[PDB]
Design a protein around this ligand. Structure first.
Ligand SMILES: Nc1ncnc2c1ncn2[C@@H]1O[C@H](COP(=O)(O)OC(=O)[C@@H](N)CO)[C@@H](O)[C@H]1O
Ligand SMILES: Nc1ncnc2c1ncn2[C@@H]1O[C@H](COP(=O)(O)OC(=O)[C@@H](N)CO)[C@@H](O)[C@H]1O
Lengths: 469, 465
């Protein structure tokens, strides 16, 4: 179905309709069309005129409706004013019986038709307008992913005296990651972390949480299962065709979906509420389990590069009246990501993402790719996006001055630490010839050792039927 | 259909190996034990189950005899042809007699094979619904018959009427549940500030303690196939299931676990561990999801999502080992709750409250002043070989033979109700909440007070103004 969750949500009266800045769009349609085309998303410049026109038609329809409503209360007076005036038996057939009372039922007849038309026009507008992307920062590089601009390169490739191995091989030998023999247990791409592997995840998560909490971020825990409206509000797609979002059985539980990032739950917390101006900027940090269907995306059958479940610590910000505040907060979040990766001793590159890779909600987006020796490639480990007022206008995330005046806040989100790919980068960058893996000083307090070595336990032995004999 | 049987039908694993010889040997003891649990099956069902099993063994013997006779016939034919050395052997009365019996045998087998598959399924579909054995000392009866084994601490004294955790938390803005119906649904919540620090602290305090006591930390998938749940003694298909399943029309056989116990069992499934490593002690922190359709609207006592650190064990050749491990897990739970400064009581759960997989089950209830009663905060169960026989969780003996291991599970710390007990036990008259020394390193304070931020204000259309 093409039913928009934000619109349906509003239709039921659960929240108000999203408040889009049509004044700006109608004032500068040419600029909007050009930026729209450069994103190469669903909607293109050819679609804009129709969207603007539907909005304009709706505005006039509402003007016509109001006009007819006011006129009805004017005709109701042509009768009310005549209940104690010549109301013997004259009014029942006076010259003002027809033409001044028959035009009262004609108005009712019209309004009964216009109200439904208004609803139809309104849905027509939102179904399309809500698929329009956010504006684009003037400095965003134009083009596909390959056009990303390298802003910083930190460190250099680790040098080995042997061919670096992949993280899965390294981990299986140390029995800290397991993916084999799980198709009928937990499915493809699923995995278990054991011993030092689990300690590595706990260490990464706690190192990151500790750092951010110490830096003034408010810790939060959010629901993992959320209604589709929240995803739509964030600029995600609960159900495009192959959808990245897992949904709970609709025949058993109504509208429940697993989030692919704590960003969803965090946005849901602020939905329909206002924060105090004095508290801006609001900085929050949240660790949660993320779920992603990963359909039609990169083929990564083995290894932790594109898994269905993983833990991620998320940074989320709600700020000021405008761009200066949100742009600065994005810069702050990025600097924190760089600090985390630098302290982990990883080689990485910071990228200014191009127009076709911003998505729908992003105005500006900075990603960081970490060098992964075994994979032999730079791989994205974090993303940071300034969504300006795209999410706030859809989910009504406001800020309030001391006086009570409400304005749309801006929202910013950024990866604090996504475990899977950091495990890849760490295991592959710190691997030793003998198969052991050195532990970065920053994580040693969590690992209780400076080197991960072969375990004492005997690895599990498969005793099932599906084996050669 | 039974997920365990289907799983085997597809050849993904062998069929569960139930201890029928023990059952058939002492059907009377099993009969009374079954009735005392007052579960699905009762004494009036054992005779049928035992009969089907016997009919199945006989059918298999009959099939074996026929398959063996078929070979004997084929050999008699080969020997006849070689012995007669004639171009017209087909016309020999004996040759035709053997060939006829050969075709008859094959016909009879075409009848027995389908019957065998049928009986086998009928047996498992019913036999798999039988509970584990029951420990001799288990108290008989319903929950009211739970036996108090020990009590630790004393009820806190207040100079005022203790308030409930939600009121306390909303005032401090550390828990939110209001206006979430269309965001995350009923019985969902957010923890903020000190509230989130409390969860972080509880989880880390428990994880650190257990890791330092020798438990191997683990991370498990949260989405698993139905077979693993069934193997643990849970019910993904009991119509009103407490297990959330991913939309079947989009993704096949994927379910959210209500405890890391499921994933941990899935790890050992179809594998064998070395005897020298027993007992295997693992600890795992995971997000748990429970539909709680049966019953429950406000408060954290019964929610749909929560974080829980789980203890899981795989041990020795028999009962002595699994029993001692359960005791070990219980003692650890008591240490954790005592160090958090909570008042609690240990219970030996009764026959009707063991469920299907448990042989022995100890629960701990913590005093919750605001609630005005004790509430279960942990459970610990010895499942002996109930899960292992269903998921083939083995161990290799000294001699080098495979035997079914025993599994044990226990709550390390379940956050929701611990928050209730902590908030309600340490609340102060002015609304602040004192922090237990053990949790102070994680909270950075000895007292949780009113937050600095201005609480969020609802600005939606559904309000008077
Ligand atoms: N299938 C998968 N397997 C392994 N790692 C994956 C993954 N999908 C995403 N990630 C990791 O999570 C980080 C997040 O995602 P993005 O989805 O880019 O950001 C957001 O979610 C924003 N809320 C900021 O974090 C990525 O940069 C990547 O390292
Ligand atoms: N809906 C809910 N809301 C809040 N807390 C809940 C809950 N369902 C269960 N719990 C908490 O998690 C612990 C777990 O469960 P049980 O299901 O008893 O055990 C097992 O799972 C075994 N694997 C041992 O932990 C319980 O003792 C209880 O404190």
């Amino acid at each position: 179905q093409d039913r928009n969750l934000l619109y349906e949500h509003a239709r039921e009266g659960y929240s108000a309709l999203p408040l889009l800045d049509m004044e700006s769009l109608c004032a500068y349609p040419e600029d909007a069309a050009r930026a729209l085309d450069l994103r190469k998303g669903e909607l293109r410049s050819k679609d804009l005129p129709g969207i603007i026109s539907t909005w304009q038609e709706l505005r006039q329809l509402r003007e016509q409706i109001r006009s007819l409503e006011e006129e009805k209360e004017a005709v109701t007076e042509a009768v009310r004013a005549l209940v104690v005036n010549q109301d013997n038996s004259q009014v029942q057939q006076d010259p003002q019986y027809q033409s001044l009372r028959a035009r009262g039922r004609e108005i009712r007849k019209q309004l009964t038709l216009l109200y439904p038309k208004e609803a139809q026009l309104e849905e027509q507008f939102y179904l399309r307008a809500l698929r329009l992307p956010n504006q684009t920062h003037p400095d965003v590089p134009v083009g596909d992913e390959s056009q990303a601009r390298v802003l910083h390169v930190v460190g250099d490739k680790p040098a080995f005296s042997f061919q670096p191995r992949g993280h899965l091989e390294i981990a299986e030998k140390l029995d800290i990651i397991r993916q084999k023999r799980l198709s009928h247990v937990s499915g493809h791409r699923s995995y278990y972390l054991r011993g030092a592997g689990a300690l590595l995840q706990h260490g990464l998560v706690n190192f990151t949480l500790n750092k951010l909490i110490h830096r003034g971020f408010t810790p939060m825990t959010v629901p993992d299962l959320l209604r589709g409206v929240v995803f739509e509000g964030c600029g995600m797609t609960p159900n495009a065709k192959p959808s990245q979002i897992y949904n709970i059985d609709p025949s058993r539980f109504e509208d429940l979906n697993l989030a692919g990032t704590a960003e969803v739950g965090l946005a849901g917390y602020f939905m329909d509420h206002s924060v105090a101006f004095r508290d801006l900027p609001i900085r929050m940090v949240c660790s949660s389990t993320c779920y992603r269907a990963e359909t039609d995306t990169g083929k990564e059958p083995w290894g932790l590069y594109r898994v269905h479940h993983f833990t991620k610590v998320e940074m989320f910000g709600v700020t000021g009246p405008g761009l200066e505040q949100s742009s600065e907060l994005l810069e702050e979040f990025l600097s924190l990501q760089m600090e985390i990766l630098t302290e982990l001793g990883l080689h990485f590159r910071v990228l200014d993402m191009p127009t076709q890779e911003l998505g729908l909600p992003a105005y500006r987006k900075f990603d960081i790719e970490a060098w992964m020796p075994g994979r032999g490639r730079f791989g994205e480990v974090t993303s940071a996006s300034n969504c300006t007022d795209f999410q706030s206008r859809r989910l009504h995330i406001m800020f309030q001055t001391e006086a009570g005046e409400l304005q749309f806040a801006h929202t910013v989100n950024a990866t604090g630490c996504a475990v899977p790919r950091l495990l890849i980068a760490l295991l592959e960058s710190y691997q030793q010839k003998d198969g052991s893996v050195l532990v970065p000083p920053a994580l040693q307090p969590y690992l209780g050792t400076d080197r991960i070595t072969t375990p004492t336990h005997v690895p599990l032995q498969y005793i099932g039927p599906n084996q050669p004999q």
